[PDB]
Design a protein around this ligand. Sequence first.
Ligand SMILES: CCC1=C(C)C2=CC3=N/C(=C\c4[nH]c(/C=C5\NC(=O)C(C)=C5CC)c(C)c4CCC(=O)O)C(CCC(=O)O)=C3CCN2C1=O
Ligand SMILES: CCC1=C(C)C2=CC3=N/C(=C\c4[nH]c(/C=C5\NC(=O)C(C)=C5CC)c(C)c4CCC(=O)O)C(CCC(=O)O)=C3CCN2C1=O
Lengths: 472, 466
Amino acid sequence: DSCGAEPIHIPGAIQEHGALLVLSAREFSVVQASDNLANYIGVDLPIGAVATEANLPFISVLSAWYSGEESNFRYAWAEKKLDVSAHRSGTLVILEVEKAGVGESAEKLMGELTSLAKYLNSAPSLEDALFRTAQLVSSISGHDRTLIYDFGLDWSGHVVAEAGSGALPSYLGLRFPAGDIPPQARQLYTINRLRMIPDVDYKPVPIRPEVNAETGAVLDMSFSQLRSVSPVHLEYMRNMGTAASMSVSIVVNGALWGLIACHHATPHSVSLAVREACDFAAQLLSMRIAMEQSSQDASRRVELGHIQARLLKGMAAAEKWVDGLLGGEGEREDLLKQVGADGAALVLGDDYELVGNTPSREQVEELILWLGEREIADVFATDNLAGNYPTAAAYASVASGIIAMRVSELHGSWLIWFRPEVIKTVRWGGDPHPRKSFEIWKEQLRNTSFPWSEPELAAARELRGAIIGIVL
Amino acid sequence: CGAEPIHIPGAIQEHGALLVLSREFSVVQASDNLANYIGVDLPIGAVATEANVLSAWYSGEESNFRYAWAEKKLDVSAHRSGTLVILEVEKAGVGESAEKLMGELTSLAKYLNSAPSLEDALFRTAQLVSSISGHDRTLIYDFGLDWSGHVVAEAGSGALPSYLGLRFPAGDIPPQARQLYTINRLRMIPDVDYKPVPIRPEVNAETGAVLDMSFSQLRSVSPVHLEYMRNMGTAASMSVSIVVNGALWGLIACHHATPHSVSLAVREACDFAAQLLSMRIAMEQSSQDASRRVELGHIQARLLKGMAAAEKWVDGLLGGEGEREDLLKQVGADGAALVLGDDYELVGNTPSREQVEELILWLGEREIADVFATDNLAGNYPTAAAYASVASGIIAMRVSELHGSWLIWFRPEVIKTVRWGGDPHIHPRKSFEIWKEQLRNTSFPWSEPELAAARELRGAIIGIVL
Ligand SMILES: CCC1=C(C)C2=CC3=N/C(=C\c4[nH]c(/C=C5\NC(=O)C(C)=C5CC)c(C)c4CCC(=O)O)C(CCC(=O)O)=C3CCN2C1=O
Ligand SMILES: CCC1=C(C)C2=CC3=N/C(=C\c4[nH]c(/C=C5\NC(=O)C(C)=C5CC)c(C)c4CCC(=O)O)C(CCC(=O)O)=C3CCN2C1=O
């Protein structure tokens, strides 16, 4: 992968819309600065120069912030009509200024986020919540489009919500490949959960010197708001037909879950106040995504537990243990519901017992012959068995998904769950330098079952213990 | 005590005015002081005109209303009360910035979401509310089952005493108060010695009944509580209900040595804080409870595996060292007794056979459709104070349809010093000086994943007996 290579956190440049000034913590002496710094601060505060009241009036407050626990800094510099925002970078203090947006009212913004927060807290459907948020951010940002983007496992992403003036195309329901947000980007966005690109064709403003005197290494601009972005992405943006962007990371249990991602046909900047409202929205949404994702997963483990109980009760109470699973109509229905499967095969040497919708004995024999040649210390699972075992495309209709599970130490006894092919049309807007066309690219997904939930596998892992234990 | 209806006192505090409109927008009821604030005659019967947004709010879904009346320097805040519109005005707190408040709640929300210890979260919140309210003390108060409360966090100028760690009796916030505060999650008393401002008429024309002031911010409070406040040495208060999944979990409770009022804007920032904290309390309370069901599941698995594999089913529980250890860990118990008629099997730390026999004789007289449980068996069965040291907590459980077979879990007395700040054992009490006691005959409380693990195992046993 050439994509993942580029180090995006140390480009030694900023965008034009602000200025960057590096101080050494000791005596607050200017080590590095953007070339444009002179234009904004409006002073000769150059390399080597030590910061005093007459340079930075907020120096006392900055000093007192550095000594304190607080991680970031904000000061509204009335006299120059600027907003100052500083983070710490080891022994360094990175300090970013940009022109203080007029016209915003915080009493409106507060009223609007009081509403979202109160609504999200009134447990609504995950989809309803997703949109409401996308809608609020579209309102206060004023972006042509405000889509929400939920990552899957493969780190491809599905546009799950959208909100737009209709100036830019509808991407709602389209999936994009993982390569569009590469691993380093993902990593950064998990710790720095907001980036704004107000003009795509901005000319990078260099930071001099390139190498910091005090550290003797490139300035890590991971948490720099003004950080100049990957030229390759500025191209991706052009291809798409966006002149402006602003993403906001949705993070649930320290995992990048998705992005709130605004776009604009023409260049478009957004106030500090409004960016700080969108971060708050992204947090509130992230708290909901977790509570939904949680209480949903919670109810599932309970529902699968009640089953595992009935299967273990039956396996203990009955004369032959096997009849706890296959004994009656209810038992054989539990065995299947225990992982939400359509079919099950309980092999015990040369003693096959098929339940529900399975492939034939001869097909399962040949399946077990191939599971024998894998490394399965836990349980084998897949929602595309065809992709692993090409010969099992012949019975895709009935088994595209299996949870295979050996139920001894000595091989030749198994419990496999089967799950049928679910065809679904996938609309990419793209395909498998960046790509020029995002025209809705279709495909039917074959030989692929409904995906195995983690409470389902965990219910299976358990039952295996129980069976393996009764066999001994 | 629970009797007195605190939602229909037909009076307001002095710090605002209340005006009831019927939609012809006609004045039905008003506080006596209304004239002083609005500065207009707008009397009983009178229909509202410009000289005398709200219209568009009434037609809309939105439940509450806010308009900052710049010209008179007032905040207007209206709720709906059936066919009525209750409308409350008070003097707009000056100087305040919403850009600050937003910045402060952006921080808290981002911090709470950065999964910190429940205690850390509790304090940070109490600290933020202490900052924007400017109250002498800003304690957080977590209800138990008995509806007594434990002060779990605090933040103060040090003007008023530290109640951190002290428990208060349920009688301090009586059932009707609790009920109201679960639906109206905010109340402010800016001056304890306020003179109640009457609402006239006492009987509303449109409804023909006393004005339900459940959601009235200005509602005059129980004289008995104004006394409790005096006894405590507080002139001012402001509570904010912490509600988690529709259940009143606790209160953010600010106090002041001298009278002290707080803007609508700042009260609405503290409600937001209480919500953000409530979302954390749920996520912690959830992912904790989640890990517990998994840990107890892995056990229930081993117990059911053993009970199926072994020759006699009973040996799945008491067979070996590991099995006997699982049986106990299945509810985090120190002891277990598996009775099967006249066939006792004691595990870990239990009371004697003769003591359990006599225990089972009393559980027979109780009626247990689920499982019997308690962390104060002494309080239910006085004679089992004799073996409190070993069984202050039991999960008793009948393990057949045919009587005479049981599975009881034992849990030992945990002595703990309880600091009350008041004798909790009607007029209110004058002294809130740290009142100590050793709490006896009481085990560590039974978690809900523990009982649920027990409920399960019973099914399994009762099923193998058939
Ligand atoms: C339709 C849904 C959607 C997608 C798929 C999407 C993509 C997206 N890519 C972004 C970032 C990057 N893409 C790339 C690189 C690539 N993207 C590609 O598609 C390809 C081929 C590359 C080459 C490695 C890089 C390095 C970055 C990090 C830029 C930086 O901060 O320095 C970013 C972050 C840019 C932003 O919005 O500020 C996005 C967000 C915007 N966005 C969307 O709304
Ligand atoms: C140390 C922790 C703590 C406690 C224990 C506490 C008590 C408290 N009592 C409150 C309310 C009431 N108590 C009572 C009644 C009693 N309080 C008592 O102590 C006693 C004996 C009674 C009657 C039996 C009533 C009716 C009310 C409802 C007042 C209203 O909503 O108008 C209220 C809510 C009233 C408020 O504070 O604004 C509180 C909150 C303040 N507060 C605390 O911070």
